[PDB]
Amino acid sequence: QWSGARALEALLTVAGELRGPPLQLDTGQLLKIAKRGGVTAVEAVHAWRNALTGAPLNLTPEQVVAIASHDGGKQALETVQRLLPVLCQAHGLTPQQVVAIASHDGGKQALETVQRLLPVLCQAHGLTPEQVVAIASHDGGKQALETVQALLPVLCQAHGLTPEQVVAIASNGGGKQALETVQRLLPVLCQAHGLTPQQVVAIASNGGGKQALETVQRLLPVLCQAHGLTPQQVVAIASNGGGKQALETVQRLLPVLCQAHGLTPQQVVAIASNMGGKQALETVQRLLPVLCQAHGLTPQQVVAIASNGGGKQALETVQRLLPVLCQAHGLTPQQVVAIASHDGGKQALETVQRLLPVLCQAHGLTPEQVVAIASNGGGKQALETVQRLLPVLCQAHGLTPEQVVAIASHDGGKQALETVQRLLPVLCQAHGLTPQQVVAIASNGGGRPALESIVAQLSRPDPALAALTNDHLVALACLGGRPALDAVKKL
DNA sequence: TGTCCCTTTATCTCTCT
DNA sequence: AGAGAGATAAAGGGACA
């Protein structure tokens, strides 16, 4: 017999029960826990289903799933029910922060280390609990936390970094490795290659930060005379997420892409300067001619699609969908390029294909409006949120579809929409803002925290803002959102 | 195998002017 | 408004007990 048969039946038996009270988990939630936390995590969730759901902890189903769905998920579940009350009552963390720390591989370790080191990091090293939480909230959080305790002094004193920079480097998966590498390579990269400490911190502050720094050290000379790449270009490739893989792939593919396709080094660097830049470049090499053939898309448009995180996904999705979206849905190919040219272009493209008919027929939007909503980062999220909230926003709150479309049509559109839905009543009824004013605040990137800052100032007034009328606060919030409001308090 | 840690890739949100 | 940046998540490998 296949040995895993017994364990699979075990998994499936306990699985079916969890669909019952008090968690009621779907198949996706169940598969998720099984694939990352394994059967032990599934058995643990069931075993501790009642201890977590309500009294005392009051963890949602979602939160239980978030904790359970990682390597050692069973350990994190045991640790949370034990340490959540300690970290909340004795260190003043919110349950949300405890759950965030918990929801990574080795969550147990992170939680116990936060419990152990938060006092010394805050008192003796001058960090805030929020900074400690951020450091802890990644795989290997325990290692990062111990490494920050160990290295914060030498990094600030011997190497001139600020505590904020140290915290930023630590606040990535593998943070311990990046910190140790920065300690070693900061003088080398700064003195031999003329990089600013800020540039070094930028390269280091990514997952795989150790690899990106070591690859910059190794490849900077070669890249900056053989290829006539500037240091600024190499730093950009190394600091934007693509890191080590992106840098090595730029070395390989720059001449190929320029010579075979007529791209500039700037176009190649742009493609490279994203998460998964390696994947994007290789896909461009493959797919550009296929996309530009038969007088199809231009190289320029192919570059734009490629030049975002998930570029590879965007490119292949366009390849699969350009025909059906243009022909069956009636989009210009220029409209398809527009939707594709953002982080998560693939998600947005697939969501437009799925939801354009529904948004048009059931909600009365134009395809232009669907395209506009789709054409931002997280376009998929904004499109699904418009589908869900258009009727309550229009019918119960009185907004026009035009206003809903405007709110949705920025990065974070989903967040802006949910926050208007949530806060419009108290803003208008309780505080005398007009709906137009609420829509105006919400119709920018950062619409949600801009709205929340306004509500905070109207419900728990900070005297530092008291000289501003509601109208002036509205103008400020529209101009620069939460940050402008915060900046104004500081003076 | 279960748990911990690290790296890559992809997606989403907000800030900075 | 479009670059820059942080946050978050999925998924695979190394390491070890």
Author numbering: 231 to 721
What does the article say, verbatim?
Transcription activator-like (TAL) effectors specifically bind to double stranded (ds) DNA through a central domain of tandem repeats. Each TAL effector (TALE) repeat comprises 33–35 amino acids and recognizes one specific DNA base through a highly variable residue at a fixed position in the repeat. The crystal structures of TAL effector (TALE) proteins bound to their respective target DNAs have revealed that the residue at position 13 is the only one directly involved in DNA base recognition, whereas the 12th residue stabilizes the proper loop conformation. dHax3, an engineered TALE protein, proved to be a useful scaffold for structural characterizations.
It also insinuates that base A may “tolerate” a wide range of amino acids at position 34 of a TALE repeat when there is no steric clash. To test this speculation, we generated dHax3 variants with the 34th residue on repeat 7 substituted with different amino acids. In total, we obtained nine high-quality structures that elucidate the accommodation of base A by Leu, Met, Cys, Pro, Trp, His, Thr, Asn, and Glu at the 34th position. These residues may all represent weak code, if they are used for base recognition.
